[PDB]
Design a protein around this ligand. Structure first.
Ligand SMILES: [Zn+2]
Ligand SMILES: [Zn+2]
Ligand SMILES: [Zn+2]
Ligand SMILES: [Zn+2]
Ligand SMILES: [Zn+2]
Ligand SMILES: [Zn+2]
Ligand SMILES: [Zn+2]
Ligand SMILES: [Zn+2]
Lengths: 445, 447, 452, 448
């Protein structure tokens, strides 16, 4: 007897989308097909798309220490409402930063009973743990995040990057990198402030494309020489993507990601919205956006992730140059991209499924996640196409109910989210069950 | 309920191989998973690999005119015994060559009741049909084959202008062009030269078709196809240098795919010398270092499909020395088991990569919506492969019309135990061929 | 003491153009500098540019057999009046074609005393002499010219014939072994021929129709094919008259990868475009076609970027009867030998600001260096005293009567040209003077590779 | 009448080497050819190669302030003895460093009467003068040197990525090239410390602590930042064919970049370095013979624009200690021409006119020295006479440096400098030493 059968949905499979039923047993996808028979429970997905749960490879929760920025409780409720069933949690903003076993075990205690979704873990590669990267590897982190160019996050200089990447290469861990030449970016920003240039266009001119390209080029070469697998975080320009593409076409093991706000917003809209649209690699002009869409449709951008980066509203007050950078968008990755990629620009459903879930799970070794296939976790989002709503602040489950998407007309709706076989979010019910999420550790799956 | 359930096999799915049951209804995959329930018939696939049936994108049958070379009866039985469930049939050797509605309708009639497997069809782009390419597009070929620079109904090569113009037309119709890429002039003149010198060993024959003759032809057709706006498929690539040309072009955005054949991964010029004219084929079997590079390209994902280029001929055309003998490998029956042994068992290729190379990639390139993958709603086309189970291939084993092959005498480390086409066992290692031939032609606009 | 001193000119040296005097003795440059002393004769070059005389690496004279198209007598007079002092003569359209020792010796005999300029020689690599290429290498040709047709076109016995891919590869291999460069007319002839037939069939016979029937990709395909075959055969390659920047880009990429390849173009691809072709008629029809203005702008950037090694005439005259008919029926070829130096000086240097030493390399030094003409192409001590004096900012309207070709037609007639050839000096003697005409008997000689 | 005629030498002209005479008047080349006539003085170059004087684009003299490392007096005598007639002086080691008008004018005062050769000038692009680059441009430096990455005030200091980008952007505006020492200094330092920690301090350990990839990374970074800034770039002393290849790739894409190397990277290898000790230690390190084979191929392929000394002397006390502790730098100013003539022309078959370009003409053209680098009418009469197939063993006593040490001491060198001529006067002669008071002059960009 199956625990559950989802019937009549347009199911996103590896190869195509088609109307098929999904049988579920013990939290796992037990069968896919027709005439699957009887089950304790039956769901009608007629007229909906059944996607694999989003796998968000770039999520800041920052609980231990900076929990008042978001925290697990609100952060993962918003994730589930946004159709995210697995997040890959960054090591930073949390204090202590997640850099060794004690720091990650501290966070593990902090999270007990608060996980509404499943969560794999990224370790930090920082200046003060190059000697102890094996610790988080043993615990089962799925990658290490660093920034280049006392329990808080710190960047690494060129030598600390090369040495840490060398070690990570030996351990089988990928390095993830925020690629901006921050020295040049800081100094251009100071220059703009001195001159009283603090518009959105001024801020973007202060983080020009070449500062992304230089940093991607440096990181690519050092990671190659170190023998380390590489993932380039939130690429903001098609020029940055081309660097990654050129490297892979020469045989380098490198992947990259972007975020919905580089496909759906632009500098002119960033000006109108204000500091809620400020983020570190900046939202560039519309011609840049067009390039990014072409890269995405060309297959050069492996994953779409949130870079959910909230902060208390006092840090968003004031002019754009002094404000804290970060987009609160975790809840609107799936519906906004389905509307903008699938409905408006004609992207195929299985390509959507790859960009929002499968690729990330394959890159980070999440064996049970990312695909509607026999034996994987029964993690789904039901999406209602051609069903619009205007997003408002009290739709948001964030701790701080703000987002540069508030007031946007969004052409599709998350109607339901299912994690390992149980409905964790329902547009008609809210959150019907106690937090059932679990951490995912590499050697424990 | 379900007509059939295949249980306990290691199934090659798109993403991974795993032990799951397959339910079948009406020639179609009805479900995949566990506890699928009741069925009229149940197969036990324990200890076997259940692969999508091979989609062989490059098969010569040659039935009207040159049926005595192979023909539909023997050729498709060999294919089903080799674990191939869909062939994509070349338009040459048959007479009339398959170049317009009349010639293909002729063939259709000749083949009635003889198809043991399913067959998509290739048109020929030749010198005398440039203006009627739309005819075979209407019938529903999935591509057009040509050879780039006799009998009025035979196959003919096209010069550079006929290629460009034909490809320009095909690009408008949404049809790929498939090309045998060698500079035939240089290969012919080097061959005569070797003949005149009395240099007629296998090594001489390969030296008379050097790598640069394949690279030049590939570079020429890549550029002409690009300027013509036509999707291109480069047939049987024999060198990694040829593969590199295709890779470089795709990396620049050109819509091009390529294929190779088991004899370029499993045989080399030294074994070719030992075997003789049965190992002679047109793009030649090259040396062992070439082979090693070939394996590296395959494991790197630069070769889209593995195909047979099954090319038998009456034995008298294999008599004589290597330079004068007819070129062609009779290998239709041993693509799947040889390749499973050499790629999966001996070199560690993953089951999903093997499934993509032998079936899924070819199905996706030629638009065979129902074939090539174990997925819900696709045709229930499978091969059961028994790993780590060896046999010595003999002529008696061969279902070809001419029971010869350069693989005879080889120890092959895996066995094809069963072949299922649209839900029915068409070949079984123990029962032989249990059902009347049930194969159908596959036409592009009718699925 | 010196035979001659040329004083006060702006002399084009390899590195720069400066006012220096030139001393000549025994037909050779004996010294360069100031206060050179006494000489049997003095010329004033004030206000003039003193350039190396042009080295035209692509001239059709066709004398033995098709002399009535041009021939040595008129052809080299026109060359001298155009400021050319060395030509590198093609093996066609002469009959017999220059393909072996017997054919070139017949030609040497016919040319005796008719050379107004010096002439290095190119052999033909043709379908029927691949086994005899050593003969012309021994004689001393400086290179071998061929047309590559995948099939091999129609032709006359003893005439220039195209080579198929095999013949090109085998010949190129032998040329690589002899140390001889292969020169190639790079156009896919079949595709151009068939598209031309298409146009005629459709009633489309304008100049724009002709250019569309020889599209850029037919040039690029042929260059790519020849680049690769010559590479494999191990042969130095020169790509003749490139008509498009896409063709230049193929040559550049090959060189950047280390291939030994050079290329050239012609003044008509820099100074005419298809719109002027349409107004001019068949006199501006040529095989690699004159393309549109956007193409011309790209050619100018290639040239200024150093990607085109040499400028040559491709002087391709024919009897005017062969210029009758519509553009698709007429014989291709530009009669332009007389107006390479002054048109290009005007268009490159005056109008577009090219440096005088770059002008000198493009018109003379690079060709001399590529084909190993040790005595030619540069104003340097010990080289031949070969010069042309050019008067800048001095214009004239070209008339038929100015032309010294056998057939006094050219697409440049009626053109306003902003500089003038005032004097041409060959091995220390005035052979052409704007005021005197041709003052001495023809003194030109053949230049042979091993007898320099 | 001419002041002088040099007769019967094999003269390296731009296009070829051939026997011709050179007439000189007023310190300039008046004529080249035969039968030039009478002169006040005649020299017999029979049997010698008459080359343009070397143009050394990378010289450290360090006079105002660190004169005791070398100084103009001994430095320029050694240059002249080695056949160098123009040096392009680096802004570093001297104190104050050459970074603005006051520091260079201070330098001009120290040099008076000490210049045996001519000296064009490089400025420093340093952390603290980015807003004042126009001053040295006005004075007439021919480029600006920097180190992209800690020092003395008024000393030479590194620039960070931002200072390099902003400075390069200004320099592109002024029409000045930027010259860069290209090593990832952080990674070299840290690997070097590692070596010491582990007790690994041989020459082979030092080279492995400055791996090729630290050169390639730094060149790639600078290539890309100079491009974005719009600045012409010169890459200093490349040590590896991998670094050259980065430069060649960028040029082939249209970037205006040039590079140089030094004799020690063609003529020494790490195994010799080990036997020599710290006198052969240099910042871009002398690599293994297989690397050296690659460098010779790059050189013969035209991928390296000039050869320069990177003369980097120091008091011998700084050469004490093991290889990891000693000060890096090669004292080799005196043995650039004769060693490269031997190794390149006599041993490896390089053409004389290519030698001329690599040792002189390219440097003069890159840095806009209109009067220098080539034997041609109207240029300065700067020559060196080289005697081929004439060998000698270098001794400490041969050296004119302040500190008479060099990693070439005791080496066999198969050609000899016999005469150096500067603007028409013999300033060095193997038969008479230095027969005229110092007559060198500074060369300023806007005053040639
Ligand atoms: Zn970030
Ligand atoms: Zn982030
Ligand atoms: Zn074939
Ligand atoms: Zn075939
Ligand atoms: Zn031509
Ligand atoms: Zn011609
Ligand atoms: Zn340095
Ligand atoms: Zn230095």
């Amino acid at each position: 007897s199956f625990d559950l059968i989802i019937k009549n949905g347009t199911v996103i499979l590896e190869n195509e989308a088609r109307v098929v039923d999904i049988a579920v047993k013990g939290g796992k996808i037990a069968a896919i097909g027709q005439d699957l028979g009887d089950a304790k429970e039956v769901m009608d997905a007629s007229g909906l798309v059944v996607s694999p749960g989003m796998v968000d490879a770039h999520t800041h929760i920052s609980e231990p220490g900076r929990s008042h920025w978001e925290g697990y409780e609100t952060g993962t409720r918003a994730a589930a409402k946004g159709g995210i069933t697995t997040m890959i949690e960054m090591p930073l903003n949390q204090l202590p930063a997640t850099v060794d076993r004690a720091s990650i075990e501290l966070k593990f205690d902090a999270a007990k009973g608060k996980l509404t979704i499943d969560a794999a873990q990224l370790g930090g590669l920082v200046s003060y743990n190059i000697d102890r990267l094996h610790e988080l590897d043993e615990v089962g982190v799925v990658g290490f995040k660093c920034f280049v160019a006392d329990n808080d996050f710190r960047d690494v200089n060129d030598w600390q990057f090369f040495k840490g990447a060398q070690k990570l290469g030996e351990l089988g861990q990928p390095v993830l990198v925020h690629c901006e030449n921050a020295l040049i970016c800081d100094e251009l920003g100071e220059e703009a402030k001195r001159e009283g240039r603090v518009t959105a266009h001024d801020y973007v001119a202060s983080r020009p494309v070449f500062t992304e390209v230089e940093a991607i080029r440096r990181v690519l070469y050092l990671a190659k020489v170190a023998g380390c697998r590489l993932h380039v975080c939130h690429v903001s320009s098609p020029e940055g993507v081309e660097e990654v593409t050129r490297a892979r076409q020469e045989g380098q093991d490198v992947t990259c990601e972007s975020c919905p706000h580089y496909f759906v917003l632009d500098t002119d809209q960033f000006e109108e919205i204000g500091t809620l649209a400020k983020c570190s690699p900046p939202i560039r002009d519309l011609e840049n956006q067009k390039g990014m869409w072409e890269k995405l449709f060309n297959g050069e951008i492996d994953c779409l992730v949130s870079d959910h980066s909230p902060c208390p509203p006092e840090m968003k007050a004031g002019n754009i140059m002094e404000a804290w950078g970060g987009i609160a968008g975790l809840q609107n990755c799936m519906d906004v991209m389905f509307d903008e990629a699938v409905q408006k620009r004609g992207m195929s459903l299985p390509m959507f499924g790859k960009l929002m879930a499968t690729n990330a799970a394959d890159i980070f070794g999440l064996q049970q996640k990312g695909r509607i296939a026999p034996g994987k976790d029964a993690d789904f989002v039901f999406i209602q196409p051609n069903s619009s709503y205007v997003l408002t602040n009290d739709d948001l489950e964030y701790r701080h109910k703000v987002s540069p998407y508030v007031g946007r007309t969004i052409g599709a709706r998350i109607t339901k989210t299912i994690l390992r076989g149980d409905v964790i979010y329902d547009i008609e019910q809210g959150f019907p069950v106690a937090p059932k999420g679990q951490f995912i550790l590499k050697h424990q799956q």
